[PDB]
Amino acid sequence: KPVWAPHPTDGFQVGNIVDIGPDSLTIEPLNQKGKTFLALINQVFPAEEDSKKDVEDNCSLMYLNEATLLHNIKVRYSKDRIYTYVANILIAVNPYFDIPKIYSSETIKSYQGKSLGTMPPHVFAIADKAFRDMKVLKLSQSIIVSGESGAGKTENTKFVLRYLTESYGTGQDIDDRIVEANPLLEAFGNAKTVRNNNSSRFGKFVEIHFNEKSSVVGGFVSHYLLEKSRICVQGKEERNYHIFYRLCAGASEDIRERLHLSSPDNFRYLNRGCTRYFANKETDKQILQNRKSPEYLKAGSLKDPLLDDHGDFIRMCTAMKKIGLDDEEKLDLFRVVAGVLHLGNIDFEEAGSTSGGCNLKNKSTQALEYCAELLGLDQDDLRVSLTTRVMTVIKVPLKVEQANNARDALAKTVYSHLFDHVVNRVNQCFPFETSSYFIGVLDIAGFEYFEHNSFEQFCINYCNEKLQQFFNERILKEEQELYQKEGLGVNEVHYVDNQDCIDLIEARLVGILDILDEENRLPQPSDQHFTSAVHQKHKDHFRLSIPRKSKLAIHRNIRDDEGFIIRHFAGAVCYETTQFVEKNNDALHMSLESLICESRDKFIRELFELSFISVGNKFKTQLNLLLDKLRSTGASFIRCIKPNLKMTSHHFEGAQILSQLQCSGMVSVLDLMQGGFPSRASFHELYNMYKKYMPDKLARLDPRLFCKALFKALGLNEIDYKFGLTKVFFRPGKFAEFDQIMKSDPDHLAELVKRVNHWLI
Ligand SMILES: Nc1ncnc2c1ncn2[C@@H]1O[C@H](COP(=O)(O)OP(=O)(O)O)[C@@H](O)[C@H]1O
Ligand SMILES: [Mg+2]
């Protein structure tokens, strides 16, 4: 009798239906006799009879729907049980605190070789299942970790990597390397944002490669779309990459002196953002007074349960040592970092009777000297390349705005090349000649939109269209095509394909990426010319509109040539096209490229061992290699859920979590997953595995008939499995029973055959 009906902040609330009207149900909130509210008939759901219970698998719920799913994960979360299944898919709700012992070496050992459902839900069980499928099916595997910014994708990726390397490694130095590589990547690719103190500003696919014996031989990291804009300016609540603050907070005085470092408020590339360190009472006393900005001294430290700038600098140096980086390479990296900081302090003032030129401000003399010294450049060549443009064979003055752009382009390119070097260096620390298979973990930002959307949002939302299509093809298309071919009679869940949105962005010649590249190649590139060419070429495209077509008031003043709206199925996004041409070029101008290639420092020359490299098309190629890997492997899915927007523990925001369950597509697949068959094996393979152990009476049976006798003898029933035309299928929550049937050990096989022989008489 009690039902779940809508609630503005909790998503749902419990009540009773007390009336029905046209298009409405009158609900009485539980224990509030007299009170009533109207709800739409289709927004009212049956509730589980026991409101206090929780189930480890949402498929076990008598009434599985968005409301009972929300309630079950809420009950579990209130008890620090952050992991819950939807059959073989994992839901992970961010606790925002360290739950004791759940990631221990002892917890790791308890999950090894255990079937899904045998142990409580855990990221370790998803990792173990991928390993077992890899070894049994002799097929590489992918674990896709998804969710909003700050939901827990990076933390869960790291738990998967740690579980696999600790369980299936050799007990050597190289096993720890794949794990120790992360504090290094995060130092250069992660930053404080309003949504996550440790936000990933690049995407990644981390593969652990195994030999024929299913033992770890090494790894490989793919990195995508490092955010370049961050390198030069941040919003007051955000920071630049962690490395800058770990270095300022933790470097020895010898390094501080050598690199001419000071408190972060002294650097333009840090001082528009937050200049405070992540520290606690103990670590703050370890940071020297000369490292602390005025804001840090007034407001105190930033608080985080994970991040500590001083502690993280020490842990990063230890990680560098463990992976094989010598002190020389560590100082080479720090020198580039400081060189970029000093570059940002180079200021310009107008010159010429019509302000057509510029001069370095006299107060920027020291910044010029320190930068040139740290980057192995001549001061004059650097001053010249930043203040003039070479073009017949003339050296022309740059205006102040153009000099700022030259400095920043060099800073972003140097930093981005340093990041590429760091990722490649990490790959060189765990190399392998050959491998039989891999387990790859995908950790990349999903669909996102803000008041202002630029080229970075465009590429990530493009990536999301391509991955969403893979998700639909794997979970909906391929799964149901199997059920159909096997005659299972599973109710069809349909989806609308998004190839028209993908083609809009990526088609050869006509796609937005190709039209943008066209602009970069033109004599005088223009964001406006690019934008009008997109509107002109796709005038009849449903996924495209002018910014004026938006309902929102913020887009009312945006001109047709100043942006476009992409009608992504996840929501219509208005992109402001200013800087799209600049952001699409990964190559430095020739005169800045020469300056840096001719550095006196071998390390700097080695970072760089009409200049145009398309960021869009480079990313399209990387994404297509990733999609080739995903399509050729088995996929396991982890859906990370952010419980609130305040980074607090024990604060379950019902409507926020519901919205994520709906937007993730989780709600749309509930019935398909509950009525589905995630485990299957052919009658022929089962029969062939048991054949040599069988007596004549057993071998005489047709494979389908042998399988039936095997299942009957073991006490299995229709609630556990269904027979297809050529395969047996096991339902959610029947993984342990399926693994017992599949276990290929001679002693186990002979034992089950003995049981069948005994049942037959
Ligand atoms: N299972 C977890 N245990 C403890 N803290 C966690 C867990 N998952 C996430 N966190 C916390 O939440 C923060 C944000 O998580 P993160 O993995 O970086 O998110 P995402 O990569 O999805 O943006 C972490 O830095 C950490 O403080
Ligand atoms: Mg992350």
Q: What is the structure's resolution, reported in angstroms to one decimal?
A: 2.0
CB atoms within 10 A of CB 395: 11
Verify that 63 and 190 share a domain, yes or no. Answer: yes
Q: Label each residue of 726-746 as H, E or C.
A: CEEEECCCCHHHHHHHHCCCH
Report the CATH number at residue 179: 3.40.850.10
Report the C-alpha gap between 359 and 607 in whole angstroms: 29
Does the annotation place 561 within a ligand binding site?
Answer: no
Q: How far is the CA of 447 from the centre of ligand 2 (A)?
A: 14
Residue nearest atom 15 in ligand 1 by C-alpha distance: 152
Q: Which one, of 209, 241, 239, 203, lies nearest residue 222 by Cα?
A: 203
Report the C-alpha gap between 598 and 595 in whole angstroms: 6
Q: How far is the CA of 174 from the centre of ligand 2 (A)?
A: 24
Q: Give every CB contact of residue 681 below 8 A, 6+ residues apart in sequence.
A: 727, 728, 738, 741, 742
Report the C-alpha gap between 134 and 551 in whole angstroms: 49
Question: Looking at the DSSP assignment, which residues form a beta bridge with residue 461?
Answer: none
Atom number, ligand 1, closest to the C-alpha of residue 305: 27
According to DSSP, residue 453 is labeled B
Residue type, 259: L
Of 155, 160, 304, the residue with max ligand 1 atoms within 8 A of its CB, to mutate for a pocket test, comes to 155
Report the C-alpha gap between 25 and 556 in whole angstroms: 39
Of 80, 90, 94, 645, the residue with max ligand 1 atoms within 8 A of its CB, to mutate for a pocket test, comes to 94
Verify that 77 and 134 share a domain, yes or no. Answer: yes
Residue 678 · residue 88 · CB < 8 Å? yes
Residue nearest atom 25 in ligand 1 by C-alpha distance: 198
Residue nearest atom 12 in ligand 1 by C-alpha distance: 96
Report the C-alpha gap between 379 and 384 in whole angstroms: 9
Verify that 290 and 393 share a domain, yes or no. Answer: no
Q: How far is the CA of 89 from the centre of ligand 1 (A)?
A: 19
Q: Which two tokens stand for residue 215?
A: 């033992």
Residue nearest atom 17 in ligand 1 by C-alpha distance: 152
Q: How far is the CA of 152 from the centre of ligand 1 (A)?
A: 4
Of 124, 158, 198, 227, the residue with max ligand 1 atoms within 8 A of its CB, to mutate for a pocket test, comes to 198
Give the number of the ligand closest to the Cα of residue 146: 1
Residues acting as catalytic residues: 149-150, 154, 196, 199-200, 446, 448
Residue keyed to tokens 């097929």: 139
Residue 16 · residue 28 · CB < 8 Å? yes
Q: Which one, of 410, 455, 433, 14, lies nearest residue 225 by Cα?
A: 455
Q: Is the dihedral of CA 116, 119, 125, 126 positive or negative?
A: positive
Q: Give every CB contact of residue 206 below 8 A, 6+ residues apart in sequence.
A: 157, 161, 178, 219, 220, 221, 222, 440, 441, 443
Report the C-alpha gap between 146 and 470 in whole angstroms: 13
Pocket of ligand 1 (CB under 6 A): 94-96, 98, 147, 149-155, 196, 198-200, 305-306, 640
Residue 128 · residue 113 · CB < 8 Å? yes
Q: How many residues are listed for the chain in this entry?
A: 761
- Helix (H) or strand (E) holding 418, with range, is helix 400-429
Does the annotation place 98 within a ligand binding site?
Answer: yes
Verify that 596 and 726 share a domain, yes or no. Answer: no
Q: Which one, of 136, 99, 129, 89, lies nearest residue 112 by Cα?
A: 129
Residue nearest atom 13 in ligand 1 by C-alpha distance: 150
Verify that 366 and 472 share a domain, yes or no. Answer: no
Q: Label each residue of 601-648 as H, E or C.
A: CHHHHHHCCCCCCEHHHHHHHHHHHHHHHHHCCEEEEEEEECCCCCCC
Residue 122 · residue 80 · CB < 8 Å? no
Report the C-alpha gap between 281 and 236 in whole angstroms: 24
Q: How far is the CA of 149 from the centre of ligand 1 (A)?
A: 9
Does the annotation place 151 within a ligand binding site?
Answer: yes
Side-chain half-sphere of 2: how many Cα atoms within 13 Å? 16
Q: Is 9 helix (H, G, I), strand (E, B) or coil?
A: coil
How far is Cα of residue 588 from the mean position of the Cα atoms in its chain?
Answer: 28
Residue type, 213: K
Verify that 192 and 159 share a domain, yes or no. Answer: yes
Report the C-alpha gap between 95 and 263 in whole angstroms: 33
Does the annotation place 503 within a ligand binding site?
Answer: no
Q: How far is the CA of 460 from the centre of ligand 2 (A)?
A: 14
Does the annotation place 155 within a ligand binding site?
Answer: yes
Does the annotation place 148 within a ligand binding site?
Answer: yes
Q: Which two tokens stand for residue 73?
A: 């994960």
Which of 609, 642, 659 marks a domain boundary? 609
Report the C-alpha gap between 545 and 58 in whole angstroms: 41
Verify that 472 and 563 share a domain, yes or no. Answer: yes
Atom number, ligand 1, closest to the C-alpha of residue 306: 27
Verify that 174 and 204 share a domain, yes or no. Answer: yes
Verify that 95 and 113 share a domain, yes or no. Answer: yes
Q: How far is the CA of 648 from the centre of ligand 1 (A)?
A: 11
CB atoms within 10 A of CB 365: 13
Atom number, ligand 1, closest to the C-alpha of residue 152: 17
Give the number of the ligand closest to the Cα of residue 190: 2
Atom number, ligand 1, closest to the C-alpha of residue 197: 25
Atom number, ligand 1, closest to the C-alpha of residue 153: 22
Atom number, ligand 1, closest to the C-alpha of residue 92: 1
Q: Beta 395-397 vs 544-545: how paired, if at all?
A: unpaired
Residue nearest atom 6 in ligand 1 by C-alpha distance: 96
Q: How far is the CA of 156 from the centre of ligand 1 (A)?
A: 8
Q: Judging by beta carbons within 10 Å of its beta carbon (0-12, 13-18, 19+), is residue 658 exposed, middle or buried?
A: buried
Q: Give every CB contact of residue 172 below 8 A, 6+ residues apart in sequence.
A: none
Verify that 283 and 173 share a domain, yes or no. Answer: no
Give the number of the ligand closest to the Cα of residue 123: 1
Task: Report how many domains make up the chain.
Answer: 6
Verify that 303 and 292 share a domain, yes or no. Answer: yes
Report the C-alpha gap between 512 and 239 in whole angstroms: 31
Verify that 474 and 615 share a domain, yes or no. Answer: yes
Which of 323, 340, 375 marks a domain boundary? 323
Q: How far is the CA of 411 from the centre of ligand 2 (A)?
A: 24
Report the C-alpha gap between 79 and 642 in whole angstroms: 16
Give the number of the ligand closest to the Cα of residue 151: 1
Residue keyed to tokens 């962690």: 242
Report the CATH number at residue 394: 1.20.120.720
Phi-psi region of 96 (alpha: psi -120 to 50; beta: other; left: phi over 0): left
Which of 256, 290, 323 marks a domain boundary? 323
Residue nearest atom 8 in ligand 1 by C-alpha distance: 152
Q: Which two tokens stand for residue 737?
A: 């029973």
Does the annotation place 150 within a ligand binding site?
Answer: yes
- Helix (H) or strand (E) holding 473, with range, is none
Give the number of the ligand closest to the Cα of residue 156: 1
Phi, psi for 640 (deg, rounded to 5):
-85, 135
Q: How far is the CA of 95 from the centre of ligand 1 (A)?
A: 8
Side-chain half-sphere of 681: how many Cα atoms within 13 Å? 23
Does the annotation place 308 within a ligand binding site?
Answer: no
Atom number, ligand 1, closest to the C-alpha of residue 157: 17
Report the C-alpha gap between 243 and 398 in whole angstroms: 32
Give the number of the ligand closest to the Cα of residue 660: 1
Does the annotation place 103 within a ligand binding site?
Answer: yes
Residue 81 · residue 120 · CB < 8 Å? yes
Atom number, ligand 1, closest to the C-alpha of residue 149: 23
Q: Which two tokens stand for residue 345?
A: 């302090």
Residue nearest atom 16 in ligand 1 by C-alpha distance: 152
Q: Beta 203-210 vs 199-200: how paired, if at all?
A: unpaired
Residue nearest atom 3 in ligand 1 by C-alpha distance: 98
Residue keyed to tokens 């019509």: 354
Report the CATH number at residue 506: 1.20.58.530
- The parent domain of residue 722 ranges over 677-761
According to DSSP, residue 474 is labeled I
Q: Which one, of 267, 207, 203, lies nearest residue 239 by Cα?
A: 267
Does the annotation place 153 within a ligand binding site?
Answer: yes
Report the C-alpha gap between 603 and 230 in whole angstroms: 24
Residue 284 · residue 303 · CB < 8 Å? no
